[PDB]
């Protein structure tokens, strides 16, 4: 009624339900859909599920979704200083992650459903945009160890390669992932 | 008591769509009529604008002023404590802008204004901006309607 | 003005004017120091950085009372001759002031 | 606190008032930060420029003691009379005091105008043009204090 | 009932009558009288008697009347931000409204109603007093875009000479209201 | 309970003629007779004062003693807002004139005061404020009871 | 019901009684015990029994009780200005005051029910622990004056022995007391 979860109606529906998807209009007036804040939402099928996954989508898929969720986890706690000074004046380390959360926001988590390809994703496709993202993450971070600037990071033409793979057809993401794990492998080859 | 979860504005949010509400500060401080935009809302508006309905830059036009009051009456509580010497350049615009809107469009007495007189308002009330800073409005309505001043309201009370 | 070195720039200090003496130890630094600051007349201090590395760190006893004396700590005598690390100073700086230690 | 109807709409009212103050602090101390992160490179010009000039100040004053030797240093250092007119004032920023130094530095008020030790006179100008950064880089130092402070103060 | 005044009795009586003068209890306390709630209360034939005003008291009485109102809005609206950080730190164009307010509260809004002579009030007196009131608004605003400071102005003699006017009889009243005219504008002038 | 909206105390005070309301954190503080003088009211007053019943100073000096202890109170609570060392003269003075006001008049114990050494108590109060913001009482009676010490009658 | 001190059960037994020993959650979270809370709690035969205490305990009893009822008093005034600006801040004077009443408060408000000695006080005991505290508080104030730091104070090995009082059997007090007198005196007097 007033926006309060503290309802008897949502309490007594809490009680009972295996799964709860909490919307949040913050990120409906930012323009970002679907509007579900992961902090609050969760599941109790995540779990019992795995056997499935790892028997017909891939064997390492749990390990990666608990990593993407662990990168969306890290960045949460960065925001009591980005709220207190700008992101400009962040160590580079956790400007990567600053970077690779925002990238993750707005182009995995972020979905078009009046769109002709992106309103529908299989396990699979979303499984490779994950290994994509990861792989970027860590050939950054491994740059970083190295010894890089964060803007020549941010120069590499892979952002646009990670951020189209929302667009491609479930026919050609097979050759789209390979060529774009190679391309990325070799231009991370290609930096000091 | 200006209380909306009494029973009788709580029920008669479930069934409307949308409402307009009046202000207790505009009314004390002279403006009549005296409608708060931040707290109304409309939710059939998309549906009754637009190309062959209105005009074309309807929706956006909405918005933009929208968020540009929405800034500027935060500016103005700040500037209480900062003062007016340490806000930014744009800031003093958004101040400016927000006592022009409700000096004008607001704020309208007995007239009957047309749509189109009401466009005419707005607009020139959203070029006290820089452009550039127009982000919800695409660029070609502004390279269309941007650039007019408000003398033509301001010597027309 | 009173500042407290090494004498050989304490001697160039009184060649321009202003009041110098000498330093050598840290229990010697910290005595002059006290004694500079519990004398009044003065306006600004300068000390060290080889022997004392916080001049207000040592006075907070007596800092809290009255405002008009203003400490500062300045280079050495060969640290000037090959410099030190500003951005260090300034960063720890940063640290102590806004507590976060964030800053490039 | 006794159980009514009007103090119920009361504690609401109070409960509103609280969010919006704390919005408009966040927004005072947002002000105050980008304030800060300007006076502090300004510092850092400062400091830097205070460190060449006492790297030539010190330079000057070595060649002087080595050449010109240290019984005439010693009684040019003695001729030249102390200096007092320093000039101090309070002015407040952002609602706060704080000192600053306007040290006359006058001219004609010390000794020897005798060139003569030439390396002694270079030296007793490089001294005193020391003594002229010294206070410059002392005036943004506490003004970038006393903005720490409040930032403090508003968090 | 308690001064509750969501009481049935009290809610009835607020849809059919005219005016509404809501009394106060904090003020009351303080010893503040009439102690009318002035953000509480409301009256809908303002706007019907103003043709009256024009006739009978001045032709610039309405006028008048809404710079009161708005003045007042304005230190309402200024008490939040008083009430969380304290009167020491606002600008000098606030002061300059918070003192005015109180002048207003303290002068213009209080009478006794045992006093010989405060007991009544014409209408022509009270215009005299806010014409007053608003010509040392007008010309203390002027002098402090001129430099000078707020804790300097309200120290001057003449709030005493405004402060006072209530008890005033209505057969002195004449001459002590341009007494004190001339006074407000050779004071400001006066002034560096 | 401590609440003045209970239905017998408001159907009480809407019969009556007044009431003297004790306060529970003036007890707490030692002080007897623990009587709170904010909520506290006597209807009938203004017929037994004034001139040729008690003094022709009476009914002023009680409105003005009302309206310096509430500026008091008020100023307490800004103090436990922001620091008692943001404070001005002023308030400083009203703060003073409040602890002294508990500590002297309203606390007296078992001795039995006339008329004329409570109004020579409220005088001695009132006396350490200015004299030109006592706006509620006539310059007559200003110029005639001003300027006593308090320690001359507690000292 | 719930810790609600309004209802009706309660407010009828507080117009009967002469004593009213008021329990507190918070004091019992954190196990001190008897979780008395000393503010609201109060006793109406505390004046009446005066003379018996005169002749059967000590002469000066009530002084001495007196007197820590105000240190308690003077404390919990104190604590809420800590809790907002910080302890470091303080004067020296205040903090002594901080210190003392939390040494008033875990030495001799708290008594354990299941130890074999501090389960029964007796009243010279008492008097004697409060003799020992104000003893303490006396010198410690008196040596503030001649520039000693909070930290050289609290530092003194004779803070241990105050806390341990309790725990002395009722045999060996009168001996205990006396040292720990003399032990205080000296301590004071070869303090710097």
């Known amino acids: 009624p007033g926006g309060d979860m503290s309802e008897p109606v949502t309490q007594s529906t809490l009680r009972i339900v295996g799964a709860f998807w909490r919307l949040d209009a913050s990120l409906a007036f930012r323009r970002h859909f679907p509007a579900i804040n992961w902090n609050g939402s969760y599941s109790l099928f995540t779990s019992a599920l795995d056997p499935w996954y790892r028997e017909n989508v891939a064997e390492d898929y749990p390990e990666l979704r608990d990593a993407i969720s662990e990168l969306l986890q890290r960045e949460a706690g960065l925001q009591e200083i980005v709220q207190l000074v700008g992101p400009d004046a962040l160590q580079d380390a956790e400007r990567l992650v600053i970077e690779v959360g925002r990238i993750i926001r707005e182009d995995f988590l972020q979905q078009n459903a009046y769109h002709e390809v992106d309103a529908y994703c299989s396990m699979k496709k979303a499984y490779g945009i994950m290994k994509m993202i990861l792989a970027f993450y860590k050939e950054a971070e491994a740059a970083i160890k190295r010894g890089v600037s964060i803007d020549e990071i941010l120069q590499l033409p892979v952002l646009e390669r990670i951020g189209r793979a929302r667009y491609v057809s479930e026919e050609e993401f097979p050759a789209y992932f390979e060529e774009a794990m190679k391309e990325i492998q070799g231009a991370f080859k290609a930096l000091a | 008591d200006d209380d909306r979860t009494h029973p009788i504005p709580d029920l008669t949010g479930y069934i409307t769509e949308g409402q307009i509400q009046l202000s207790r500060e505009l009314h004390r401080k002279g403006i009549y009529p005296p409608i708060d935009p931040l707290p109304s809302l409309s939710r059939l508006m998309n549906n009754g604008v637009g190309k062959g309905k209105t005009r074309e830059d309807h929706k956006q036009v909405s918005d933009q002023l929208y968020s540009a009051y929405a800034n500027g009456v935060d500016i103005r509580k700040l500037v209480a404590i900062i003062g007016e010497d340490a806000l930014t350049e744009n800031d003093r615009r958004y101040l400016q802008f927000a006592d022009a809107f409700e000096r004008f469009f607001i704020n309208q007495g007995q007239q009957n204004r047309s749509i189109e007189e009401s466009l005419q308002i707005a607009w020139a009330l959203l070029s006290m901006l820089p452009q550039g800073e127009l982000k919800r409005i695409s660029k070609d309505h502004i390279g269309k309607y941007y650039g007019q001043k408000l003398e033509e309201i301001w010597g027309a009370p | ?104 | 606190v006794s159980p009514t109807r009007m103090n119920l709409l009361q504690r609401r009212g109070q409960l509103r008032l609280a969010q919006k103050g704390v919005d408009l602090l966040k927004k005072k101390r947002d002000a105050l930060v980008a304030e800060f992160f300007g006076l502090v490179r300004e510092a850092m010009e400062a400091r830097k420029a205070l460190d060449q000039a006492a790297k030539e100040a010190y330079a000057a004053l070595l060649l002087a003691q080595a050449f010109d030797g240290p019984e005439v240093v010693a009684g040019a250092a003695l001729g030249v009379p102390p200096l007092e007119g320093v000039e101090a004032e309070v002015e407040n920023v952002w609602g706060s005091k704080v000192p600053r130094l306007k040290a006359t530095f006058p001219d004609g008020a010390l000794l020897s105008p005798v060139g003569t030790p030439a390396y002694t006179l270079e030296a007793s100008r490089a001294f005193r043009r020391y003594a002229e950064a010294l206070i410059r880089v002392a005036n943004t130092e506490t003004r970038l204090k006393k903005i720490g402070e409040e930032i403090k103060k508003t968090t």
């Open chain 3, 1 to 104: 003005m009173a500042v407290i070195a090494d004498p050989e720039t304490a001697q160039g200090f009184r060649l321009a004017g202003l009041e110098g003496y000498g330093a050598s130890s840290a229990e010697e630094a910290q005595s002059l120091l006290e004694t500079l600051v519990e004398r009044g007349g003065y306006a600004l201090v300068a000390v060290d950085e080889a022997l004392l590395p916080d001049p207000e760190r040592a006075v907070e006893r007596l800092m809290r009372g009255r405002d008009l004396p203003v400490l500062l700590p300045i280079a050495g005598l060969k640290e000037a001759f090959q410099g030190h690390d500003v951005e260090g100073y300034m960063r720890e700086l940063v640290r102590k002031t806004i507590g976060f230690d964030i800053k490039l």
